RNA sequence: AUCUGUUUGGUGGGAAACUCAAAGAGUGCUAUGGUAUGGUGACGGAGUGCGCUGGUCAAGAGUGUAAAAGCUUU
RNA sequence: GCGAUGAUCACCCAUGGGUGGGUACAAAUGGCAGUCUGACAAGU
RNA sequence: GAGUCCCAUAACCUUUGUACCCAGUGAGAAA
C-alpha cells in the first residue's frame, strides 16, 4: 500500500543503523505472525529494539514500541543481525557482539584500536561477519573462533559490503573510489570483479536474491544495476528529485529496488525497467 | 434492547428538558404525539422527544419509524410528567418536537442538544 | 387454481408430481422455483382460504363452459343457420346487438357487415373519411382464415350470406333446425374464399 | 401514429406555448419540439387525501 | 388531480418527464395499482387490447436522488438493466424509484440496519421482486458478502460520519471496475463544526484516497440546504 | 485552511516569517496550512539549492493533501481544487497565479508583503 | 504465499488452489489491478479444487448465519478437513485466504495448522473469483447462483427481522378487497337469478327478499310442490305455498340452466361468510385492539383504506377516516382508534386489554353525552 | 354580406438485401503448459532400504526458582 | 369530582316536519344517435 | 371500393328510484 505501519521517534541523533530480527528469547516465545521486530543503533550510545503490530495474518483477536534498550559507552555506527540464535553485531568506536537477552556485549571483536564504519553478516554460513573500518580496511570475523579472521587495506574507504546470497563466500564492497569490488573470502589478494561505471563515491551496494546482479547507489545522485559477470553498469536510474542516494536494497522479489535518498524520500524502482508485473498468458510469456 | 431504546441518562435528560422549556417559551415547541407526527411529516422539526413510560409504549413508538424515514434525531426521556412540566402545560405530554426556526434565539442550544442525542443515537 | 389445489405447499410440490395440469415442460421450472424461491411459508388457516378460492374459481370456469353450452344449444335451436355460417357466440352477439332476431333479419347485409363498428362508422361518415369494413363480424372463423384485403372482401360476402341465412331463420315457418341453408351458404363462402386465396398479386 | 398525433395535436401545442397561458407563471426558456415517442396519461390522485388536489 | 399530462423520456434512461403546466419527474411503476409512500400516479393506456400501465411521481423533497436528477447530473449510473447496491435504504421511499428505474431485468440490493424499516422493506420487496432487502450493518460488508455479488453502481444515502469508510468497504467488496459511486453527503450529519464546503472537500478527498475518482458534484440546493451528491466512478487503477 | 505554493515558501524564508505563526498573526485565527504533492514535487525539483525550503515544508504542523493527476503543475492544481470547492485560502506570490485567483470569486489570497503576510479577499480580518 | 482460497457462496463452499502468486509489492499497479478483471489472466492465478454444495435452502440459511457471525459450521469443517493438507502447527502452517478477519480465528480454533490471511492480496483474489463466478466453477453446481442469491437474501433478511406471516396484514387487505368484489358478484348474480325466475312466479322475490334464502329455496322448488314442511328454512312458507297454488307466471333446459345459476349463487354465498369468519379471525390475531374497539369488518376496511397496518399506525390521529356531539364522537373515536392501531402494530404479539380500555373510554365518552 | 382586414395555420438525395467489400466500437466463450503425459526395456509395476510429514511420550539443554512449577528448544 | 393519551372552533316554524343544490349505486324502447358502397372482378 | 379487434360489449348527458353532506386548528373547558 506504500504506507507506514508505524513511525517512531527512536533516538535523538542520527539513527546510524537499523536491521530486523526474529528475537530468540528463551523465556518468551516470539509472535512473528503479528509482531515484527526491528532494532536500531544511533550515535547517542544506544541500541533499541522495537516491535511492530503487523496485519498480515488474521489469526488473532498490543504494546508496540521499545521492548528493550541496549546501552554502550561510545557511539555506534552500524548494525546487522545474525540470521539465527538471537545475536547481532554493532560497529562503532569498536565492534561488539550482542544477543537480545543480555544487556551488555558478549564479546568485543576488534582487530586494533581503529573504529568500524559498517557491518554485514553472511546470509549462508551465517557465522561469518565482515566490517569496514575508516582506516580503509575490510575485516572478516568468524564467530566459531570468536575472533577476527583476516583483513585487507585498500586505497580508499569501503562504504558498504553485501554478501552473495547464492555463493556464500563472495561479497561485494562499495567504496570511495568510484567503483565496486567483488571479492572472494578465501582469497582477498585480488578482486574477482570491478564494477566501474559510477562517477562519485559509491555509498551502498546490494545483491539480488538470485545472486546474479547487484544494485549500487552512489554519491552522484544516481543508482546503477550491474550484471555480476560483466563489470559495467547494465542500467542507470536517476531523477531530478533524487539527491545523494545513501541506501539501496534489492527487494526479496528480485524485481524491485528500494533506494533511500537524502532529500527524505524512499523510492521503488523496477530492476528490469521494461518488465511489467502482471501475470502473463503463455503467448505473451513466450 | 427494549422498544424505547435510545434513552438518555440524567444529565442529558436535564439538558433536553431545559431546552424544551426554553423552546416552549419561544413558541418553537409542538407538544403532543399527533402534533409531533404532523410536524414530522411536514418536515419542520429538529428533534423529537418521546417519554419512555406512558401507559402503552407503542402509542409513541410509531414516531421512531417516521424520524428514521426523514433522518431526524429522536430521544427518550424517562418521565412524561417532567416532560409535560418542562413543556409548560398542566398535563403530562408523551411526545414533543422542536420545530425549525432561523430567527430563533436558542439555535446554538438546540444544535448542541441535537449533537449530543445524535452521538447517543 | 388446479395446481394449488393439487399441491398447496412448496415442499409438498417437492414430494408430489402432476401431469393432468401444466403439460410436460413447466414441471422442471416449477420444481426449480419450488427449490429456490423468495417466497415465505404459509399456514394452514389461510391455506384453507387459498384452497377455497381456488376451488371457487375452478367451479366458476365450469359454470362458464356450461353456460356456453347453453348458449350454443339455444342458438342452434333459435337461429341455426347463422350458427352454421358464422358461429354460435358471434351470431349471438349479433342478435343481442340488434335486439330481436326479426329486427336483425330486416336489416340489409351491409348493416350486418358493419354491425359492431358504429362509432368508427359514424365518425367516418360525419367527416368524409373511409368507413370500417369488419364490425362485429370480424371474429368469424372464415374472416380468420382470410388474410389481407380479402378479409374485407369476405366480410362482405359473409355478411351477404349471413343476411340470407338469418332472415331465412327468422322468417321461415317450415324450418327444420338442421342447418341446411346455413350449410349451403357456408359452402358458397368457403369456395369463394378458396378462389380469392388462390390468386396472388405477385407475377410468377 | 399520425392518426393519434391528429388527436393530441392541440394539447401538444398548449404545452409548447405554455408560457402564454397564465400571465403569472413564467417558465424557464426551453424550446420543446414534439418528442418522437410520447404517451398521454391521466393523473390518479388516490383515495387517501381529499379536497386539496381533488 | 385528474388532469392530463404527456409522458416524455428524459435524457437519463429509465426515467421520464410528465409535462403539463407543472412538469413532474416520473418513473414507470413496477407494481402497478398502488402507491408506496403516497405519491401521485399517472396511468397511460398504451397499445389484445391496450393495457393500462402506470407511472409514479418522484418527489425531490423526499428523495436526494430525484433532487440530484432534476438539479441536473451529467451521468447517473443507475440505469435500466443494472445492479444497484443501495446503502441506507431507510425505508422504501427512494428504493422503490431506484428499483423501477433499474427495471425487471436488474437488481437493487437494499441494505438497511434498523428493523421496522426492514419490515417495510420486505413487504415492499414482495410486490417489487427486483429488490433484495438485506437487513445488516453496512459497516461490516462481510456479514452479507454471501448474499450480494458484483454490483454495478453503489448508492449511499447513509447519514453517518464514517460514511467514506462504509462506501469504500462496500465498493471494494461488491463494486466492479469503472462502476458507479453515487453519494449523498449531508454536511450537518458528518460534522457541524466546519462549513459545508470544507466537509464536501474532505469527503471528496477521502473518496480519491480510497480510489474512487469523482466526476461531478451537485449541491442540490432548492430542495435541501447543505447537501450534496458526488458522482464518481470506481477507477481501481489510475485515477491519474 | 490555506494552500501554499513554492514561491510563497521561498519568500517566507527570504523574509524570515514562520509559516503557521505568520498565518496566525495575519488572520488572527487558527490556520491549517496545506502543501499539495505537486507543490512538494516542485520544491523537490528545485534542486539542492533549496534544501532549507524543502525541509521547512517538511513540518508536522503543515498538513498535506494528495493531488491525483499527472504532472507537477501546482498552479493548475491549486486553481482547479480551489474553484471546485471555495473553502480554501490561497497563499501565493506568483503574479500569474495571483491574477487567476483574484479573478475567480470568493477566494481569499494571502501573500508575503514586507515582513509579514498580507491577506486581501477575506472580508473579516479585524 | 497464499496457497489456498476459501470462497463462500449461496450454493455451497469452494476451495481454490492458488497457482501463481500475484505481486505483493506491485499490487497497486495498473496491470496487476486489471489482471483480475481480465479472465484470461485470472485463470493463471486461481484453480478450483473443491466445491461442496449445500443440502438445500435450510442448510444455506444456517451457513449464511454462521458465515455472517463468523463461525465455522460443520460443512466448513468437512470441506476444509478434506482439502487442506495436514501441515504443522509450529512450523510453516498451510495458508488459507479468507475474506473475513473474524472468521479466521474460528478457523484456527478448529485447525491449528492453518494460518488465515485476509489482507488486500486475499481481498482482490476473493473479488476476482466474485467477479467471474460461474466461469471458474467449470459447470459443477446445480442452480443458478443469482437465483440462489435471491432466495438466500430474502431468507436471511426475514430471519434477521423475525418476519412472521401470521401477523401479516396483506392477508386482511386482500381478504376485504376480495370480499367487496364478491359482495357485488353475489348481488348481480342473484339479481339475474331473480330476473330469470320472475317469469316462473314473481312473488318469491316479494316474500323472500334475501338473495341466499331465495336462491336456496328455488334450488329445490321447480314446480308446484303442498308438503310445505321443509321450506321454512312458517308464515312466509305458507304464503309461498299459497302463491304456488295461485301460480301466475309461465321450460326444462332453461330451468335446468337457471338451477345451475342458482347453485353458483349458493356456492358464492357460502364462500362468503367463510371468508368473513376467516377475516374476523385474522383480524383478531393481527389487530386485536382495533377489532375490540370498532369491530373486525370496520377495522378491516380501515386498514384497507389506509393501505397497511403500518400506514394506519404512522398516520396522524387527526387524519383518520373512520366510518355536534355526533360530530365530535367521530374525532374521539378517531384518535382513540389511531392510538389502538399504533399499540397493535408496534407490539410484537399483541393482547386485547388496551383495546378493551379504549372501548371503555369511548363508551364512557358517548354515555356522558 | 359585389362588408372587413388583422391574426393563426398551411402553400410559396432516396429505396431494396440469404449482395459484395473496407474499417471502428462493445460483448460473449475456460480464454487455463510459470517452464507441458507416469514411462525413447535408457522403461514400467511390485516389494525392501534410505529420505519426508504429523501428533504423542521420554531424554537433553536453556531460562526461572528456596525448591519448583511454568515457558523456550533448527 | 376535565384536558396534548388532545380543550376548542341552504330557505320556513311554536327533539319533529316542509323545499331543494352535490355525493355514490342501479335503471331507462330517455338523449347524443344517424346503421357503408352498388356491378364488375379473376383467368386464357 | 372501403379507419372497428384501440372498449356502441362503450363513453358522456338527462331523468327516475336508494344512503349521506350543504377537515385542519392547537389550550382550553367548566363555574
Ligand atoms: Zn497537485
Amino acid at each position: 500500500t506504500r504506507e507506514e505501519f508505524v513511525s517512531f521517534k527512536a533516538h535523538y541523533g542520527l539513527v546510524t543503523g537499523l536491521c530486523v530480527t526474529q528475537p530468540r528469547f528463551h523465556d518468551k516465545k516470539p509472535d512473528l505472525k503479528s509482531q515484527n521486530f526491528m532494532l536500531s543503533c544511533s550515535d547517542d550510545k544506544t541500541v533499541k529494539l522495537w516491535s511492530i503490530n503487523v496485519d498480515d495474518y488474521s489469526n488473532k483477536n498490543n504494546e508496540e514500541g521499545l521492548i528493550r534498550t541496549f546501552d554502550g559507552e561510545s557511539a555506534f555506527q552500524g548494525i546487522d543481525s545474525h540470521r539465527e540464535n538471537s545475536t547481532f553485531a554493532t560497529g562503532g568506536a569498536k565492534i561488539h557482539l550482542w544477543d537480545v537477552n543480555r544487556l551488555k556485549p558478549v564479546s568485543d571483536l576488534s582487530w586494533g584500536a581503529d573504529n568500524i564504519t559498517s557491518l554485514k553478516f553472511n546470509q549462508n554460513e551465517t557465522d561469518i561477519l565482515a566490517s569496514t573500518g575508516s582506516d580503509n580496511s575490510i575485516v572478516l570475523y568468524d564467530l566459531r573462533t570468536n575472533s577476527p579472521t583476516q583483513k585487507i587495506v585498500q586505497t580508499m574507504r569501503t562504504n558498504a559490503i553485501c554478501w552473495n546470497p547464492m555463493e556464500a563466500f563472495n561479497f561485494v564492497t562499495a567504496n570511495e573510489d568510484h567503483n565496486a569490488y567483488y571479492y572472494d573470502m578465501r582469497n582477498l589478494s585480488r578482486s574477482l570483479n570491478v564494477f566501474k561505471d559510477h562517477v562519485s563515491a559509491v555509498m551502498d551496494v546490494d545483491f539480488s536474491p538470485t545472486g546474479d546482479e547487484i544494485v549500487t547507489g552512489s554519491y552522484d545522485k544516481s543508482i546503477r544495476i550491474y550484471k555480476t559477470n560483466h563489470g559495467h553498469s547494465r542500467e542507470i536510474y536517476h531523477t531530478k528529485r533524487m539527491q545523494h542516494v545513501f541506501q539501496v536494497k534489492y527487494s526479496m522479489d528480485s524485481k524491485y529496488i528500494i533506494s533511500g535518498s537524502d532529500d527524505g524520500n524512499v523510492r521503488l524502482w523496477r530492476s528490469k525497467a521494461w518488465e511489467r508485473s502482471n501475470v502473463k498468458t503463455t503467448r505473451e510469456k513466450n | 434492547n427494549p422498544k424505547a431504546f435510545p434513552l438518555a441518562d440524567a444529565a442529558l435528560t436535564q439538558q433536553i428538558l431545559d431546552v424544551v422549556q426554553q423552546a416552549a417559551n419561544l413558541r418553537q415547541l409542538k407538544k403532543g404525539a399527533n402534533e409531533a407526527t404532523k410536524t414530522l411529516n411536514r418536515g419542520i422539526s429538529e428533534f423529537i422527544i418521546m417519554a419512555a413510560d406512558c401507559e402503552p409504549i407503542e402509542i409513541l413508538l410509531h414516531l421512531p419509524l417516521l424520524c428514521e424515514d426523514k433522518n431526524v434525531p429522536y430521544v427518550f426521556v424517562p418521565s412524561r410528567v417532567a416532560l409535560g412540566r418542562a413543556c409548560g402545560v398542566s398535563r403530562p405530554v408523551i411526545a414533543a418536537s422542536i420545530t425549525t426556526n432561523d430567527a430563533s434565539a436558542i439555535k446554538t442550544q438546540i444544535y448542541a442538544v441535537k449533537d449530543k442525542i445524535e452521538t447517543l443515537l | 387454481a388446479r395446481i394449488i389445489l393439487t399441491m398447496g405447499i412448496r415442499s409438498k410440490a417437492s414430494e408430489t408430481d402432476l401431469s393432468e395440469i401444466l403439460p410436460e415442460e413447466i414441471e422442471e421450472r416449477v420444481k426449480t422455483a419450488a427449490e429456490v424461491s423468495m417466497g415465505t411459508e404459509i399456514t394452514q388457516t389461510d391455506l384453507d382460504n387459498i384452497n377455497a378460492l381456488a376451488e371457487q374459481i375452478v367451479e366458476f370456469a365450469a359454470y362458464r363452459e356450461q353456460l356456453s353450452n347453453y348458449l350454443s344449444a339455444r342458438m342452434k335451436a333459435i337461429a341455426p343457420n347463422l350458427t352454421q355460417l358464422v358461429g354460435e357466440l358471434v351470431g349471438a352477439r349479433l342478435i343481442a346487438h340488434s335486439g330481436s332476431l326479426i329486427s336483425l333479419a330486416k336489416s340489409p347485409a351491409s348493416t350486418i357487415q358493419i354491425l359492431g363498428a358504429e362509432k368508427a362508422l359514424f365518425r367516418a361518415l360525419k367527416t368524409k373519411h373511409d368507413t370500417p369494413k369488419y364490425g362485429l363480424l370480424y371474429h368469424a372463423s372464415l374472416v380468420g382464415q382470410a388474410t389481407g384485403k380479402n378479409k374485407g372482401k369476405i366480410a362482405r360476402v359473409l355478411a351477404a350470406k349471413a343476411a340470407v341465412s338469418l332472415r331465412y331463420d327468422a322468417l321461415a315457418e317450415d324450418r327444420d333446425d338442421s342447418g341446411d341453408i346455413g350449410l349451403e351458404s357456408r359452402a358458397k363462402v368457403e369456395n369463394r374464399l378458396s378462389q380469392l386465396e388462390g390468386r396472388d398479386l405477385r407475377t410468377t | 401514429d399520425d392518426n393519434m398525433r391528429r388527436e393530441v395535436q392541440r394539447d401538444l401545442l398548449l404545452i409548447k406555448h405554455r408560457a402564454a397561458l397564465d400571465p403569472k407563471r413564467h417558465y424557464k426558456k426551453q424550446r420543446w419540439e414534439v418528442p418522437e415517442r410520447f404517451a398521454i396519461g391521466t393523473i390518479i390522485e388516490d383515495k387517501s387525501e381529499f379536497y386539496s388536489s381533488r | 388531480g385528474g388532469a392530463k399530462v404527456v409522458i416524455e423520456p428524459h435524457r437519463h434512461a429509465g426515467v421520464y418527464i410528465a409535462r403539463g403546466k407543472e412538469d413532474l419527474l416520473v418513473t414507470k411503476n413496477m407494481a402497478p395499482g398502488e402507491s408506496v409512500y403516497g405519491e401521485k400516479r399517472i396511468s397511460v393506456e398504451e397499445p389484445v387490447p391496450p393495457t393500462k400501465v402506470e407511472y409514479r411521481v418522484w418527489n425531490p423533497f423526499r428523495s436526494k436522488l430525484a433532487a440530484g436528477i432534476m438539479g441536473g447530473l451529467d451521468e447517473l449510473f443507475i440505469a435500466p438493466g443494472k445492479k444497484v447496491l443501495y446503502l441506507g435504504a431507510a425505508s422504501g421511499t427512494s428504493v422503490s424509484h431506484v428499483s423501477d428505474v433499474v427495471g425487471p431485468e436488474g437488481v437493487v440490493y437494499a441494505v438497511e440496519f434498523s428493523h421496522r424499516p426492514g419490515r417495510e422493506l420486505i413487504s415492499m420487496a414482495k410486490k417489487r421482486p427486483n429488490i433484495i432487502p438485506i437487513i445488516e450493518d453496512a459497516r461490516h460488508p462481510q456479514k452479507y458478502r454471501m448474499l450480494i455479488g458484483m454490483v454495478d453502481c453503489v448508492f449511499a444515502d447513509v447519514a453517518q460520519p464514517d460514511q467514506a469508510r462504509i462506501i469504500a468497504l462496500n465498493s471494494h467488496m461488491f463494486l466492479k471496475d469503472q462502476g458507479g459511486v453515487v453519494i449523498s453527503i449531508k454536511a450537518n450529519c458528518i460534522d457541524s463544526t466546519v462549513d459545508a464546503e470544507t466537509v464536501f472537500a474532505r469527503e471528496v478527498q477521502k473518496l480519491r484516497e480510497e480510489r474512487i475518482k469523482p466526476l461531478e458534484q451537485l449541491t442540490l440546493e432548492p430542495y435541501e440546504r447543505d447537501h450534496c451528491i458526488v458522482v464518481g466512478r470506481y477507477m481501481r487503477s489510475g485515477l491519474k | 485552511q490555506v494552500l501554499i505554493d513554492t514561491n510563497f515558501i521561498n519568500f517566507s524564508i527570504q523574509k524570515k516569517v514562520d509559516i503557521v505563526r505568520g498565518m496566525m498573526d495575519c488572520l488572527l485565527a487558527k490556520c491549517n496550512p496545506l502543501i499539495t504533492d505537486c507543490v512538494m514535487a516542485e520544491l523537490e525539483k528545485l534542486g539542492p539549492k533549496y534544501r532549507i525550503a524543502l525541509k521547512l515544508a517538511r513540518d508536522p504542523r503543515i498538513k498535506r493533501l494528495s493531488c491525483s493527476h499527472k504532472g507537477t503543475y501546482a498552479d493548475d492544481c491549486l486553481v482547479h481544487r480551489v474553484l471546485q470547492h471555495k473553502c480554501y485560502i490561497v497563499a501565493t506570490n506568483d503574479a500569474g497565479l495571483k491574477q487567476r485567483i483574484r479573478k475567480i470569486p470568493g477566494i481569499p489570497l494571502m501573500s508575503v508583503g514586507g515582513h509579514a503576510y498580507v491577506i486581501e479577499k477575506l472580508p473579516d480580518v479585524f | 504465499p497464499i496457497e489456498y482460497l476459501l470462497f463462500e457462496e449461496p450454493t455451497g463452499y469452494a476451495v481454490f488452489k492458488v497457482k501463481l502468486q500475484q505481486d505483493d509489492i506491485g499490487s497497486r499497479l495498473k496491470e496487476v489491478q486489471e489482471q483480475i478483471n481480465d479472465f484470461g489472466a485470472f485463470t493463471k492465478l486461481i484453480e478450483l479444487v473443491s466445491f461442496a454444495p449445500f443440502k438445500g435452502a435450510a442448510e444455506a440459511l444456517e451457513n449464511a448465519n454462521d458465515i455472517s457471525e463468523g463461525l465455522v459450521s460443520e460443512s466448513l469443517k468437512a470441506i476444509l478437513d478434506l482439502n487442506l493438507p495436514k501441515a504443522s502447527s509450529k512450523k510453516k502452517n498451510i495458508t488459507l485466504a479468507i475474506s473475513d478477519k473474524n472468521l479466521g480465528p474460528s478457523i484456527k480454533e478448529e485447525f491449528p495448522y492453518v494460518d488465515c490471511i485476509s489482507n488486500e492480496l486475499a481481498q482482490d483474489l476473493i473479488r476476482g473469483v466474485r467477479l467471474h463466478g460461474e466461469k471458474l466453477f467449470k459447470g459443477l453446481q446445480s442452480g443458478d447462483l443469482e437465483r440462489a442469491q435471491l432466495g438466500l437474501g430474502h431468507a436471511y433478511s426475514r430471519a434477521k427481522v423475525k418476519f412472521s406471516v401470521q401477523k401479516n396484514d396483506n392477508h386482511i387487505i386482500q381478504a376485504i378487497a376480495l370480499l367487496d368484489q364478491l359482495d357485488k358478484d353475489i348481488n348481480t348474480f342473484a339479481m339475474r337469478v331473480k330476473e330469470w325466475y320472475g317469469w316462473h312466479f314473481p312473488e318469491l322475490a316479494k316474500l323472500v327478499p334475501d338473495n341466499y334464502t331465495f336462491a336456496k329455496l328455488v334450488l329445490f322448488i321447480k314446480d308446484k310442490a303442498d308438503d310445505s314442511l321443509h321450506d321454512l328454512a312458517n308464515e312466509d312458507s305458507g304464503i309461498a305455498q299459497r302463491v304456488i297454488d295461485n301460480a301466475r307466471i309461465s321450460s326444462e333446459t332453461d330451468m335446468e340452466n337457471v338451477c345451475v345459476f342458482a347453485q353458483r349463487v349458493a356456492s358464492l354465498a357460502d364462500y362468503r361468510r367463510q371468508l368473513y369468519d376467516y377475516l374476523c379471525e385474522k383480524m383478531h390475531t393481527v389487530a386485536p385492539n382495533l377489532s375490540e374497539l370498532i369491530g373486525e369488518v370496520i377495522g378491516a376496511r380501515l386498514i384497507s383504506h389506509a393501505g397497511s397496518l403500518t400506514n394506519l399506525s404512522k398516520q396522524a390521529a387527526s387524519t383518520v377516516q373512520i366510518l355536534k356531539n355526533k360530530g365530535r364522537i367521530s374525532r374521539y373515536l378517531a384518535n382513540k382508534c389511531s392510538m389502538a392501531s399504533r399499540i397493535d402494530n408496534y407490539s410484537e404479539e399483541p393482547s386485547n386489554v388496551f383495546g378493551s380500555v379504549l372501548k371503555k373510554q369511548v363508551e364512557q365518552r358517548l354515555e356522558f353525552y
Side-chain angles (χ1 to χ4, degrees), chain F residues 38 67 69 77:
Chain F
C38 57
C67 59
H69 50 85
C77 187

Side-chain angles (χ1 to χ4, degrees), chain F residues 57-78:
Chain F
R58 285 178 207 277
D59 185 14
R61 288 181 306 181
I62 296 179
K63 295 290 155 283
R64 49 182 308 156
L65 289 167
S66 299
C67 59
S68 297
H69 50 85
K70 290 189 211 289
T72 78
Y73 195 31
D75 309 348
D76 261 342
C77 187
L78 258 61

Side-chain angles (χ1 to χ4, degrees), chain F:
Chain F
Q1 46 195 15
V2 181
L3 298 154
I4 313 171
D5 65 334
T6 77
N7 43 15
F8 188 83
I9 280 187
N10 298 339
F11 274 128
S12 279
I13 298 153
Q14 197 260 325
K15 295 304 200 324
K16 286 194 192 41
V17 190
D18 205 70
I19 308 293
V20 311
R21 292 208 280 255
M23 276 164 186
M24 275 206 58
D25 68 346
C26 169
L27 297 185
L28 312 162
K30 168 172 290 308
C31 281
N32 312 329
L34 304 171
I35 287 290
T36 43
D37 293 343
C38 57
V39 159
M40 204 64 172
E42 196 168 330
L43 275 168
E44 283 165 19
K45 278 193 233 161
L46 280 168
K49 298 216 195 70
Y50 285 76
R51 298 176 68 186
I52 300 100
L54 182 62
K55 72 179 299 303
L56 288 178
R58 285 178 207 277
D59 185 14
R61 288 181 306 181
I62 296 179
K63 295 290 155 283
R64 49 182 308 156
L65 289 167
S66 299
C67 59
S68 297
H69 50 85
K70 290 189 211 289
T72 78
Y73 195 31
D75 309 348
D76 261 342
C77 187
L78 258 61
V79 160
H80 290 171
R81 82 164 60 235
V82 79
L83 70 92
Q84 179 71 32
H85 277 112
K86 312 267 183 324
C87 64
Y88 284 119
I89 307 189
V90 174
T92 178
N93 280 315
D94 220 342
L97 194 64
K98 266 161 98 188
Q99 291 290 336
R100 286 182 90 170
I101 293 296
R102 82 178 64 160
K103 278 207 298 185
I104 54 183
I107 299 307
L109 182 135
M110 178 193 275
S111 84
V112 194
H115 44 266
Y117 298 159
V118 312
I119 179 77
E120 47 161 25
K121 282 161 72 208
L122 181 54
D124 44 272
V125 301
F126 89 119

Side-chain angles (χ1 to χ4, degrees), chain A residues 49-261:
Chain A
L49 170 61
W50 319 80
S51 83
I52 322 291
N53 274 331
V54 182
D55 284 36
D56 50 355
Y57 307 95
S58 86
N59 303 326
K60 299 309 190 303
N61 68 344
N62 282 97
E63 314 106 358
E64 275 184 340
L66 194 48
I67 76 175
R68 41 176 69 245
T69 309
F70 310 95
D71 224 333
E73 63 273 60
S74 52
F76 304 97
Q77 177 55 40
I79 190 172
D80 197 37
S81 157
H82 200 284
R83 278 152 210 258
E84 283 92 6
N85 54 47
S86 68
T87 307
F88 58 97
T90 78
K94 45 180 67 193
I95 162 173
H96 288 116
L97 195 83
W98 299 80
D99 73 312
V100 291
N101 315 126
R102 309 193 47 240
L103 290 189
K104 276 308 164 176
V106 168
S107 61
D108 184 14
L109 319 160
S110 291
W111 193 283
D114 293 74
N115 78 311
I116 295 302
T117 46
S118 170
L119 263 189
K120 284 301 296 292
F121 267 97
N122 199 344
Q123 331 200 11
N124 45 359
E125 263 283 330
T126 42
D127 39 7
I128 297 160
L129 191 54
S131 84
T132 81
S134 83
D135 43 355
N136 312 125
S137 89
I138 316 170
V139 194
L140 306 194
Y141 314 93
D142 199 15
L143 296 203
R144 264 79 45 95
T145 82
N146 213 46
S147 68
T149 309
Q150 199 200 30
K151 71 187 284 289
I152 55 170
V153 195
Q154 281 206 332
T155 41
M156 310 195 65
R157 184 175 43 88
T158 300
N159 282 277
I161 308 168
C162 187
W163 291 84
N164 199 321
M166 285 280 301
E167 283 183 1
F169 35 74
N170 286 104
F171 56 97
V172 57
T173 70
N175 76 333
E176 290 278 303
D177 56 308
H178 322 306
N179 43 17
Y181 301 123
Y182 195 33
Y183 274 123
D184 198 352
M185 157 194 197
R186 307 163 311 173
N187 176 31
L188 293 175
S189 64
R190 49 175 283 101
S191 175
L192 68 156
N193 214 0
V194 180
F195 306 103
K196 272 179 88 78
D197 264 329
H198 272 308
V199 312
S200 178
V202 183
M203 291 289 119
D204 205 359
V205 74
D206 208 73
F207 263 102
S208 180
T210 59
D212 268 298
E213 88 185 14
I214 59 164
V215 68
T216 293
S218 69
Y219 195 78
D220 63 298
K221 319 165 199 152
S222 86
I223 85 170
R224 282 192 190 262
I225 313 151
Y226 298 82
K227 199 65 72 183
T228 307
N229 49 48
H230 186 220
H232 283 266
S233 69
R234 187 207 84 186
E235 173 70 63
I236 174 172
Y237 292 153
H238 62 89
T239 297
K240 204 192 293 284
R241 305 208 225 163
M242 183 163 62
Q243 322 268 336
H244 285 352
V245 45
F246 275 111
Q247 280 292 298
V248 198
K249 294 289 168 293
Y250 211 106
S251 87
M252 306 309 288
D253 221 323
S254 60
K255 287 175 184 50
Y256 301 87
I257 284 168
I258 291 97
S259 94
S261 172

Side-chain angles (χ1 to χ4, degrees), chain E residues 8-71:
Chain E
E8 174 198 2
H10 201 95
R11 171 168 42 103
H12 298 130
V15 75
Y16 309 92
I17 312 177
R19 316 259 187 204
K21 278 168 70 172
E22 318 97 329
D23 43 355
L24 286 305
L25 195 76
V26 152
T27 185
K28 204 152 175 165
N29 197 3
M30 196 63 46
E34 68 266 34
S35 166
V36 49
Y37 63 99
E39 77 268 54
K40 50 173 66 169
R41 287 170 299 151
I42 294 98
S43 85
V44 316
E45 181 86 78
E46 65 177 3
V48 52
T51 176
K52 295 177 74 70
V53 81
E54 77 177 4
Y55 289 86
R56 272 163 60 247
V57 166
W58 207 346
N59 192 9
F61 298 104
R62 292 179 43 82
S63 199
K64 318 266 174 261
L65 191 45
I69 287 176
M70 74 151 57

Side-chain angles (χ1 to χ4, degrees), chain A residues 1-2 29 33 55-61 251 253 255-256 268 270 276-282, chain G residues 20 23 25-26 28-29 31-32 35 40-41 44 90 93 98 101 104-105 108 115-117 119-120:
Chain A
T1 64
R2 302 205 264 279
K29 172 83 191 292
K33 287 162 187 297
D55 284 36
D56 50 355
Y57 307 95
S58 86
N59 303 326
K60 299 309 190 303
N61 68 344
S251 87
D253 221 323
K255 287 175 184 50
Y256 301 87
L268 276 300
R270 300 187 195 268
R276 304 297 173 251
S277 60
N278 45 12
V279 74
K280 288 155 203 317
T281 80
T282 73
Chain G
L20 285 155
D23 205 351
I25 302 178
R28 287 294 181 83
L29 302 185
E31 53 262 6
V32 178
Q35 77 181 355
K44 296 299 204 181
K90 291 295 188 172
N93 306 326
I98 60 190
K101 64 101 179 177
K108 181 169 274 292
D115 49 12
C116 282
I117 292 181
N119 42 46
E120 270 206 329

